[PDB]
Design a protein around this ligand. Structure first.
Ligand SMILES: [Cl-]
Ligand SMILES: [Cl-]
Lengths: 242, 243
Protein backbone atom coordinates (compact mmCIF):
# COMPACT_ATOMS: atom_id res chain seq x y z
CA UNK A 1 0.00 0.00 0.00
CA UNK A 2 1.03 3.65 -0.63
CA UNK A 3 2.54 4.03 2.95
CA UNK A 4 5.95 2.85 1.53
CA UNK A 5 5.82 5.24 -1.52
CA UNK A 6 4.86 8.29 0.65
CA UNK A 7 6.17 8.28 4.28
CA UNK A 8 4.75 10.41 7.13
CA UNK A 9 7.89 12.60 6.72
CA UNK A 10 7.30 13.12 2.97
CA UNK A 11 3.54 13.90 3.48
CA UNK A 12 4.37 16.42 6.28
CA UNK A 13 7.13 18.04 4.10
CA UNK A 14 4.66 18.36 1.14
CA UNK A 15 1.79 19.73 3.33
CA UNK A 16 4.12 21.62 5.72
CA UNK A 17 1.81 24.67 6.45
CA UNK A 18 -1.59 22.87 6.90
CA UNK A 19 -1.17 23.07 10.75
CA UNK A 20 -0.45 26.87 10.70
CA UNK A 21 -2.58 28.91 13.16
CA UNK A 22 -4.13 30.77 10.16
CA UNK A 23 -5.28 27.50 8.47
CA UNK A 24 -8.88 26.53 9.45
CA UNK A 25 -7.88 22.87 8.66
CA UNK A 26 -5.08 22.85 11.33
CA UNK A 27 -4.83 19.36 12.92
CA UNK A 28 -7.61 17.95 10.63
CA UNK A 29 -5.89 16.41 7.53
CA UNK A 30 -3.71 13.64 9.11
CA UNK A 31 -1.25 11.27 7.36
CA UNK A 32 -3.03 8.38 9.19
CA UNK A 33 -6.41 9.42 7.62
CA UNK A 34 -4.87 9.72 4.08
CA UNK A 35 -3.27 6.22 4.38
CA UNK A 36 -6.52 4.70 5.80
CA UNK A 37 -8.68 6.31 3.02
CA UNK A 38 -6.22 5.12 0.32
CA UNK A 39 -6.64 1.48 1.52
CA UNK A 40 -10.39 1.85 0.67
CA UNK A 41 -9.55 2.66 -3.05
CA UNK A 42 -7.95 -0.32 -4.89
CA UNK A 43 -5.39 0.85 -7.47
CA UNK A 44 -4.79 4.37 -6.00
CA UNK A 45 -0.97 4.81 -6.09
CA UNK A 46 -0.59 1.05 -6.87
CA UNK A 47 -1.24 1.30 -10.69
CA UNK A 48 1.73 1.24 -13.11
CA UNK A 49 5.50 1.61 -12.62
CA UNK A 50 6.97 3.32 -9.50
CA UNK A 51 7.32 6.73 -11.27
CA UNK A 52 3.64 6.57 -12.45
CA UNK A 53 2.47 5.67 -8.89
CA UNK A 54 4.43 8.66 -7.45
CA UNK A 55 3.05 10.95 -10.26
CA UNK A 56 -0.49 9.72 -9.33
CA UNK A 57 0.08 10.60 -5.61
CA UNK A 58 1.70 13.97 -6.65
CA UNK A 59 -1.18 14.73 -9.10
CA UNK A 60 -3.86 13.89 -6.46
CA UNK A 61 -2.06 15.91 -3.72
CA UNK A 62 -1.35 18.76 -6.23
CA UNK A 63 -4.98 19.17 -7.39
CA UNK A 64 -6.41 18.83 -3.84
CA UNK A 65 -3.67 21.26 -2.57
CA UNK A 66 -4.93 23.86 -5.14
CA UNK A 67 -8.60 23.33 -4.05
CA UNK A 68 -7.61 23.97 -0.39
CA UNK A 69 -4.60 26.32 -0.80
CA UNK A 70 -3.79 29.07 1.75
CA UNK A 71 -0.85 30.19 -0.44
CA UNK A 72 0.06 33.63 -1.82
CA UNK A 73 3.03 34.59 -4.07
CA UNK A 74 5.13 36.11 -1.20
CA UNK A 75 4.23 33.33 1.35
CA UNK A 76 7.03 31.71 3.39
CA UNK A 77 8.29 28.51 1.65
CA UNK A 78 6.41 29.79 -1.46
CA UNK A 79 2.76 29.34 -2.52
CA UNK A 80 3.21 25.58 -3.29
CA UNK A 81 3.80 24.71 0.43
CA UNK A 82 0.30 25.96 1.57
CA UNK A 83 -1.90 23.05 0.43
CA UNK A 84 -4.65 21.60 2.67
CA UNK A 85 -5.12 24.91 4.61
CA UNK A 86 -8.96 25.00 4.23
CA UNK A 87 -11.88 22.65 5.09
CA UNK A 88 -14.89 24.50 3.62
CA UNK A 89 -15.62 26.75 0.60
CA UNK A 90 -15.17 30.50 1.29
CA UNK A 91 -18.24 32.74 0.95
CA UNK A 92 -20.47 30.23 -0.97
CA UNK A 93 -23.23 32.13 -2.92
CA UNK A 94 -25.27 28.87 -3.51
CA UNK A 95 -26.64 25.80 -1.58
CA UNK A 96 -25.35 23.64 -4.52
CA UNK A 97 -28.78 21.90 -4.63
CA UNK A 98 -29.92 20.51 -8.03
CA UNK A 99 -33.09 18.57 -7.05
CA UNK A 100 -34.25 15.26 -8.70
CA UNK A 101 -35.80 11.88 -7.74
CA UNK A 102 -32.36 10.43 -8.77
CA UNK A 103 -30.44 13.09 -6.71
CA UNK A 104 -32.54 14.44 -3.79
CA UNK A 105 -31.61 17.41 -1.45
CA UNK A 106 -31.77 17.50 2.41
CA UNK A 107 -33.81 20.33 4.06
CA UNK A 108 -31.55 23.22 5.21
CA UNK A 109 -28.32 21.43 4.07
CA UNK A 110 -25.71 23.18 1.82
CA UNK A 111 -23.46 21.12 -0.54
CA UNK A 112 -20.74 23.84 -0.81
CA UNK A 113 -17.12 22.65 -1.22
CA UNK A 114 -15.70 20.49 1.59
CA UNK A 115 -12.49 18.51 2.08
CA UNK A 116 -9.52 18.04 -0.24
CA UNK A 117 -11.37 18.12 -3.64
CA UNK A 118 -13.94 20.70 -2.34
CA UNK A 119 -16.70 18.13 -3.10
CA UNK A 120 -19.83 20.12 -4.12
CA UNK A 121 -23.50 19.36 -5.14
CA UNK A 122 -26.21 17.13 -3.53
CA UNK A 123 -25.58 14.57 -6.37
CA UNK A 124 -21.85 14.10 -5.50
CA UNK A 125 -22.51 13.91 -1.69
CA UNK A 126 -25.22 11.34 -2.58
CA UNK A 127 -23.14 9.09 -4.95
CA UNK A 128 -19.93 9.32 -2.83
CA UNK A 129 -21.72 8.55 0.48
CA UNK A 130 -23.37 5.50 -1.18
CA UNK A 131 -19.93 4.28 -2.45
CA UNK A 132 -18.18 4.74 0.98
CA UNK A 133 -21.17 3.52 3.09
CA UNK A 134 -21.78 6.86 4.92
CA UNK A 135 -24.93 9.07 4.56
CA UNK A 136 -23.20 12.33 3.35
CA UNK A 137 -26.50 13.53 1.74
CA UNK A 138 -28.07 14.11 5.26
CA UNK A 139 -24.68 14.75 6.99
CA UNK A 140 -22.63 16.64 4.35
CA UNK A 141 -20.46 18.39 7.02
CA UNK A 142 -18.93 14.91 7.85
CA UNK A 143 -16.67 15.71 4.84
CA UNK A 144 -15.22 18.63 6.95
CA UNK A 145 -15.40 16.94 10.46
CA UNK A 146 -14.18 13.31 9.84
CA UNK A 147 -10.69 13.15 8.24
CA UNK A 148 -10.94 9.59 6.78
CA UNK A 149 -14.36 10.46 5.20
CA UNK A 150 -12.77 13.79 3.99
CA UNK A 151 -9.96 11.95 2.13
CA UNK A 152 -12.37 9.22 0.89
CA UNK A 153 -14.55 11.92 -0.84
CA UNK A 154 -11.44 13.27 -2.68
CA UNK A 155 -10.18 9.73 -3.58
CA UNK A 156 -13.76 8.76 -4.63
CA UNK A 157 -13.76 11.84 -6.96
CA UNK A 158 -10.26 10.96 -8.29
CA UNK A 159 -11.15 7.26 -8.91
CA UNK A 160 -14.69 7.67 -10.38
CA UNK A 161 -15.39 8.20 -14.12
CA UNK A 162 -18.28 10.64 -14.93
CA UNK A 163 -18.75 10.02 -18.72
CA UNK A 164 -17.79 11.70 -20.96
CA UNK A 165 -15.06 12.45 -18.30
CA UNK A 166 -12.55 9.61 -17.60
CA UNK A 167 -11.33 9.17 -13.98
CA UNK A 168 -8.27 11.34 -13.06
CA UNK A 169 -6.80 7.92 -12.05
CA UNK A 170 -7.10 6.40 -15.56
CA UNK A 171 -5.63 9.66 -17.04
CA UNK A 172 -2.51 9.99 -14.77
CA UNK A 173 -1.80 6.18 -14.92
CA UNK A 174 -2.03 6.17 -18.79
CA UNK A 175 -4.96 3.63 -18.69
CA UNK A 176 -7.07 6.37 -20.43
CA UNK A 177 -6.40 6.44 -24.21
CA UNK A 178 -7.81 9.54 -25.98
CA UNK A 179 -10.61 8.89 -28.57
CA UNK A 180 -10.52 10.30 -32.16
CA UNK A 181 -12.88 13.02 -30.75
CA UNK A 182 -10.44 13.77 -27.82
CA UNK A 183 -7.49 13.92 -30.32
CA UNK A 184 -9.45 16.43 -32.53
CA UNK A 185 -10.39 18.38 -29.32
CA UNK A 186 -6.66 18.53 -28.26
CA UNK A 187 -7.37 16.41 -25.11
CA UNK A 188 -4.03 14.60 -24.44
CA UNK A 189 -2.86 12.32 -21.57
CA UNK A 190 -1.01 13.90 -18.59
CA UNK A 191 -1.59 16.27 -15.62
CA UNK A 192 -3.47 18.81 -17.84
CA UNK A 193 -6.28 16.30 -18.56
CA UNK A 194 -6.80 15.89 -14.73
CA UNK A 195 -7.35 19.72 -14.54
CA UNK A 196 -9.82 19.22 -17.45
CA UNK A 197 -11.77 16.51 -15.50
CA UNK A 198 -11.74 18.67 -12.31
CA UNK A 199 -12.68 22.19 -13.61
CA UNK A 200 -12.11 22.12 -17.42
CA UNK A 201 -15.27 24.18 -18.15
CA UNK A 202 -13.81 27.27 -16.38
CA UNK A 203 -10.00 26.64 -16.65
CA UNK A 204 -9.21 24.69 -19.90
CA UNK A 205 -9.06 25.57 -23.63
CA UNK A 206 -9.03 29.36 -22.86
CA UNK A 207 -5.24 30.03 -22.64
CA UNK A 208 -3.23 31.01 -19.51
CA UNK A 209 -5.01 30.88 -16.08
CA UNK A 210 -3.42 31.69 -12.63
CA UNK A 211 -5.55 28.82 -11.11
CA UNK A 212 -4.05 26.31 -13.63
CA UNK A 213 -0.47 27.60 -12.95
CA UNK A 214 -1.19 27.07 -9.18
CA UNK A 215 -2.32 23.44 -9.89
CA UNK A 216 0.96 22.88 -11.83
CA UNK A 217 3.18 24.49 -9.12
CA UNK A 218 1.92 22.09 -6.42
CA UNK A 219 2.28 19.09 -8.81
CA UNK A 220 5.87 20.02 -9.80
CA UNK A 221 6.96 20.60 -6.15
CA UNK A 222 5.53 17.19 -5.08
CA UNK A 223 7.14 15.44 -8.11
CA UNK A 224 10.46 17.15 -7.14
CA UNK A 225 10.18 15.76 -3.53
CA UNK A 226 9.41 12.23 -5.00
CA UNK A 227 12.37 12.73 -7.46
CA UNK A 228 10.16 11.84 -10.50
CA UNK A 229 9.63 13.69 -13.81
CA UNK A 230 6.35 15.60 -14.36
CA UNK A 231 5.46 13.66 -17.54
CA UNK A 232 4.09 15.69 -20.53
CA UNK A 233 1.08 17.98 -21.19
CA UNK A 234 1.01 19.63 -17.69
CA UNK A 235 -1.43 22.44 -18.69
CA UNK A 236 -4.90 22.27 -20.37
CA UNK A 237 -4.85 25.81 -21.94
CA UNK A 238 -5.19 24.15 -25.43
CA UNK A 239 -7.60 21.27 -24.47
CA UNK A 240 -11.38 21.57 -25.10
CA UNK A 241 -13.34 20.87 -21.87
CA UNK A 242 -14.74 17.29 -21.50
CA UNK B 1 -19.90 64.70 3.22
CA UNK B 2 -18.80 61.40 4.86
CA UNK B 3 -14.99 62.21 4.96
CA UNK B 4 -15.87 64.39 8.04
CA UNK B 5 -17.66 61.40 9.71
CA UNK B 6 -14.91 58.83 8.82
CA UNK B 7 -11.27 60.08 8.70
CA UNK B 8 -8.41 58.34 6.83
CA UNK B 9 -7.09 57.25 10.27
CA UNK B 10 -10.46 55.76 11.31
CA UNK B 11 -10.82 53.92 7.94
CA UNK B 12 -7.26 52.46 8.17
CA UNK B 13 -7.81 51.47 11.87
CA UNK B 14 -11.04 49.65 10.89
CA UNK B 15 -9.27 47.95 7.92
CA UNK B 16 -5.87 47.62 9.66
CA UNK B 17 -4.87 44.19 8.15
CA UNK B 18 -6.15 44.58 4.53
CA UNK B 19 -2.57 45.39 3.30
CA UNK B 20 -0.90 42.40 5.08
CA UNK B 21 1.21 40.06 2.93
CA UNK B 22 -1.37 37.21 2.96
CA UNK B 23 -4.21 39.52 1.68
CA UNK B 24 -4.58 39.30 -2.13
CA UNK B 25 -6.16 42.83 -2.17
CA UNK B 26 -3.05 44.37 -0.53
CA UNK B 27 -2.46 47.98 -1.70
CA UNK B 28 -5.71 48.11 -3.78
CA UNK B 29 -8.51 49.39 -1.48
CA UNK B 30 -7.89 53.09 -0.64
CA UNK B 31 -9.55 55.65 1.66
CA UNK B 32 -9.56 58.11 -1.29
CA UNK B 33 -11.48 55.60 -3.52
CA UNK B 34 -14.10 54.96 -0.74
CA UNK B 35 -14.67 58.77 -0.25
CA UNK B 36 -14.79 59.36 -4.07
CA UNK B 37 -17.26 56.44 -4.65
CA UNK B 38 -19.47 57.61 -1.70
CA UNK B 39 -20.01 60.96 -3.57
CA UNK B 40 -21.81 59.06 -6.43
CA UNK B 41 -24.50 57.81 -3.95
CA UNK B 42 -26.04 60.82 -2.19
CA UNK B 43 -27.88 59.75 0.97
CA UNK B 44 -25.13 57.21 1.84
CA UNK B 45 -23.76 58.21 5.32
CA UNK B 46 -25.82 61.48 5.08
CA UNK B 47 -29.31 60.02 5.90
CA UNK B 48 -30.67 60.40 9.47
CA UNK B 49 -29.15 61.59 12.78
CA UNK B 50 -25.35 61.50 13.47
CA UNK B 51 -25.36 58.04 15.16
CA UNK B 52 -27.53 56.61 12.25
CA UNK B 53 -25.03 57.95 9.64
CA UNK B 54 -22.13 56.31 11.55
CA UNK B 55 -24.20 53.07 11.88
CA UNK B 56 -24.80 53.15 8.08
CA UNK B 57 -21.03 53.51 7.35
CA UNK B 58 -20.27 50.80 10.01
CA UNK B 59 -22.99 48.48 8.55
CA UNK B 60 -21.73 48.96 4.96
CA UNK B 61 -18.09 48.41 5.97
CA UNK B 62 -19.14 45.48 8.24
CA UNK B 63 -21.09 43.56 5.57
CA UNK B 64 -18.42 44.19 2.89
CA UNK B 65 -15.71 43.24 5.47
CA UNK B 66 -17.45 39.83 5.90
CA UNK B 67 -17.67 39.32 2.08
CA UNK B 68 -13.88 39.93 1.82
CA UNK B 69 -12.63 38.70 5.24
CA UNK B 70 -9.21 37.09 5.80
CA UNK B 71 -10.02 36.65 9.51
CA UNK B 72 -9.46 33.53 11.64
CA UNK B 73 -10.24 33.03 15.35
CA UNK B 74 -6.55 33.54 16.42
CA UNK B 75 -5.93 36.48 14.01
CA UNK B 76 -3.89 39.46 15.28
CA UNK B 77 -6.31 42.17 16.64
CA UNK B 78 -9.13 39.57 16.34
CA UNK B 79 -11.03 38.22 13.30
CA UNK B 80 -13.04 41.51 12.93
CA UNK B 81 -9.86 43.47 11.95
CA UNK B 82 -9.30 41.41 8.72
CA UNK B 83 -11.91 42.95 6.39
CA UNK B 84 -11.09 43.89 2.76
CA UNK B 85 -8.38 41.17 2.56
CA UNK B 86 -9.80 39.69 -0.71
CA UNK B 87 -10.59 41.22 -4.13
CA UNK B 88 -11.84 38.21 -6.19
CA UNK B 89 -13.88 35.10 -5.23
CA UNK B 90 -11.51 32.20 -4.30
CA UNK B 91 -11.85 29.00 -6.39
CA UNK B 92 -15.15 30.00 -8.13
CA UNK B 93 -17.29 26.86 -9.03
CA UNK B 94 -19.28 28.70 -11.77
CA UNK B 95 -18.93 31.42 -14.48
CA UNK B 96 -22.10 33.01 -12.89
CA UNK B 97 -23.66 33.35 -16.40
CA UNK B 98 -27.49 33.19 -16.56
CA UNK B 99 -28.18 33.70 -20.32
CA UNK B 100 -30.41 36.82 -20.71
CA UNK B 101 -31.69 39.00 -23.60
CA UNK B 102 -31.02 42.18 -21.50
CA UNK B 103 -27.54 41.09 -20.17
CA UNK B 104 -25.82 38.73 -22.65
CA UNK B 105 -22.75 36.97 -21.11
CA UNK B 106 -19.46 38.13 -22.72
CA UNK B 107 -17.08 35.61 -24.44
CA UNK B 108 -14.52 34.10 -22.00
CA UNK B 109 -15.78 36.38 -19.13
CA UNK B 110 -16.65 35.16 -15.61
CA UNK B 111 -19.03 37.01 -13.20
CA UNK B 112 -17.56 35.52 -9.98
CA UNK B 113 -17.46 37.73 -6.87
CA UNK B 114 -15.42 40.94 -7.11
CA UNK B 115 -14.84 43.92 -4.84
CA UNK B 116 -16.29 44.77 -1.42
CA UNK B 117 -19.80 43.19 -1.93
CA UNK B 118 -18.43 40.29 -4.08
CA UNK B 119 -20.77 41.41 -6.93
CA UNK B 120 -21.77 38.21 -8.85
CA UNK B 121 -23.77 37.22 -12.01
CA UNK B 122 -23.93 38.80 -15.51
CA UNK B 123 -27.33 40.37 -14.61
CA UNK B 124 -25.86 42.23 -11.54
CA UNK B 125 -22.70 43.36 -13.46
CA UNK B 126 -25.12 44.54 -16.19
CA UNK B 127 -27.60 46.45 -13.95
CA UNK B 128 -24.79 47.90 -11.74
CA UNK B 129 -22.71 48.94 -14.81
CA UNK B 130 -25.74 50.73 -16.32
CA UNK B 131 -26.27 52.69 -13.04
CA UNK B 132 -22.59 53.88 -12.66
CA UNK B 133 -21.93 54.41 -16.44
CA UNK B 134 -19.39 51.52 -16.81
CA UNK B 135 -19.67 48.52 -19.19
CA UNK B 136 -19.15 45.90 -16.43
CA UNK B 137 -21.07 43.26 -18.49
CA UNK B 138 -18.21 43.25 -21.09
CA UNK B 139 -15.38 44.30 -18.66
CA UNK B 140 -16.33 42.62 -15.33
CA UNK B 141 -12.75 42.59 -13.94
CA UNK B 142 -12.91 46.47 -13.73
CA UNK B 143 -14.57 45.77 -10.34
CA UNK B 144 -11.16 44.27 -9.29
CA UNK B 145 -8.74 46.71 -11.16
CA UNK B 146 -10.21 50.22 -10.42
CA UNK B 147 -10.73 50.99 -6.68
CA UNK B 148 -13.40 53.70 -7.27
CA UNK B 149 -15.49 51.35 -9.55
CA UNK B 150 -14.86 48.58 -6.91
CA UNK B 151 -16.39 50.71 -4.08
CA UNK B 152 -19.18 51.99 -6.42
CA UNK B 153 -20.40 48.37 -7.13
CA UNK B 154 -20.74 47.77 -3.34
CA UNK B 155 -22.47 51.16 -2.71
CA UNK B 156 -24.75 50.48 -5.76
CA UNK B 157 -25.72 47.15 -4.10
CA UNK B 158 -26.22 48.89 -0.69
CA UNK B 159 -28.47 51.66 -2.13
CA UNK B 160 -30.56 49.63 -4.68
CA UNK B 161 -33.88 47.99 -3.72
CA UNK B 162 -34.67 44.60 -5.40
CA UNK B 163 -38.39 44.04 -4.44
CA UNK B 164 -39.37 42.30 -2.27
CA UNK B 165 -35.96 43.26 -0.72
CA UNK B 166 -35.69 46.87 0.52
CA UNK B 167 -32.25 48.55 0.09
CA UNK B 168 -29.78 47.94 2.96
CA UNK B 169 -29.69 51.80 3.04
CA UNK B 170 -33.44 52.13 3.81
CA UNK B 171 -33.21 49.32 6.49
CA UNK B 172 -30.22 50.79 8.42
CA UNK B 173 -31.60 54.41 8.26
CA UNK B 174 -35.09 53.26 9.46
CA UNK B 175 -36.76 54.58 6.23
CA UNK B 176 -37.96 50.94 5.69
CA UNK B 177 -41.13 50.14 7.72
CA UNK B 178 -41.74 46.36 8.02
CA UNK B 179 -45.15 45.28 6.59
CA UNK B 180 -47.62 43.15 8.62
CA UNK B 181 -46.17 40.08 6.79
CA UNK B 182 -42.52 41.13 7.62
CA UNK B 183 -43.48 41.52 11.35
CA UNK B 184 -44.97 37.95 11.69
CA UNK B 185 -41.91 36.66 9.69
CA UNK B 186 -39.68 38.33 12.35
CA UNK B 187 -38.24 40.76 9.73
CA UNK B 188 -37.59 43.94 11.83
CA UNK B 189 -35.43 47.07 11.27
CA UNK B 190 -31.72 46.84 12.18
CA UNK B 191 -28.47 45.21 11.04
CA UNK B 192 -30.04 41.67 10.91
CA UNK B 193 -32.38 42.73 8.08
CA UNK B 194 -29.31 43.92 6.02
CA UNK B 195 -27.88 40.36 6.36
CA UNK B 196 -31.33 39.08 5.19
CA UNK B 197 -31.21 41.37 2.10
CA UNK B 198 -27.57 40.37 1.31
CA UNK B 199 -27.81 36.53 1.73
CA UNK B 200 -30.95 35.69 3.80
CA UNK B 201 -31.84 32.57 1.74
CA UNK B 202 -28.62 30.81 2.89
CA UNK B 203 -28.00 32.57 6.25
CA UNK B 204 -31.31 33.65 7.93
CA UNK B 205 -34.23 31.97 9.78
CA UNK B 206 -32.20 28.74 10.35
CA UNK B 207 -30.87 29.45 13.89
CA UNK B 208 -27.20 30.20 14.61
CA UNK B 209 -24.90 30.61 11.56
CA UNK B 210 -21.15 31.40 11.82
CA UNK B 211 -21.36 33.73 8.77
CA UNK B 212 -24.05 35.87 10.52
CA UNK B 213 -21.94 36.09 13.72
CA UNK B 214 -18.95 37.23 11.56
CA UNK B 215 -21.07 40.00 9.87
CA UNK B 216 -22.15 41.20 13.35
CA UNK B 217 -18.55 41.06 14.74
CA UNK B 218 -17.33 43.52 12.06
CA UNK B 219 -20.39 45.82 12.50
CA UNK B 220 -19.92 45.97 16.31
CA UNK B 221 -16.14 46.67 16.11
CA UNK B 222 -16.78 49.51 13.59
CA UNK B 223 -19.57 50.95 15.82
CA UNK B 224 -17.12 50.69 18.80
CA UNK B 225 -14.47 52.70 16.84
CA UNK B 226 -17.20 55.29 15.87
CA UNK B 227 -18.28 55.31 19.62
CA UNK B 228 -21.94 54.70 18.55
CA UNK B 229 -24.49 52.11 19.73
CA UNK B 230 -25.36 49.15 17.49
CA UNK B 231 -29.13 49.70 17.39
CA UNK B 232 -31.53 46.74 17.77
CA UNK B 233 -32.10 43.36 16.02
CA UNK B 234 -28.47 42.62 14.99
CA UNK B 235 -29.05 38.95 13.93
CA UNK B 236 -31.43 37.26 11.43
CA UNK B 237 -31.37 33.79 13.15
CA UNK B 238 -35.21 34.02 13.58
CA UNK B 239 -36.05 36.08 10.42
CA UNK B 240 -37.73 34.33 7.44
CA UNK B 241 -35.71 35.22 4.29
CA UNK B 242 -37.08 38.11 2.13
CA UNK B 243 -38.37 36.86 -1.28
CL1 LIG C 1 -15.77 16.92 -28.22
CL1 LIG D 1 -42.92 35.27 4.34
Amino acid sequence: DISKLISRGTFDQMLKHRNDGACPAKGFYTYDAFIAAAKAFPGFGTTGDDATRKREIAAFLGQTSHETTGGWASAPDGPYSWGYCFLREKNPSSSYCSPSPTYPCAAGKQYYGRGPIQLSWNYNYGQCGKAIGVDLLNNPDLVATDPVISFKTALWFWMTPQSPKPSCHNVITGIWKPSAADQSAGRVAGYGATTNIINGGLECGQGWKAQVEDRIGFYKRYCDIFKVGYGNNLDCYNQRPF
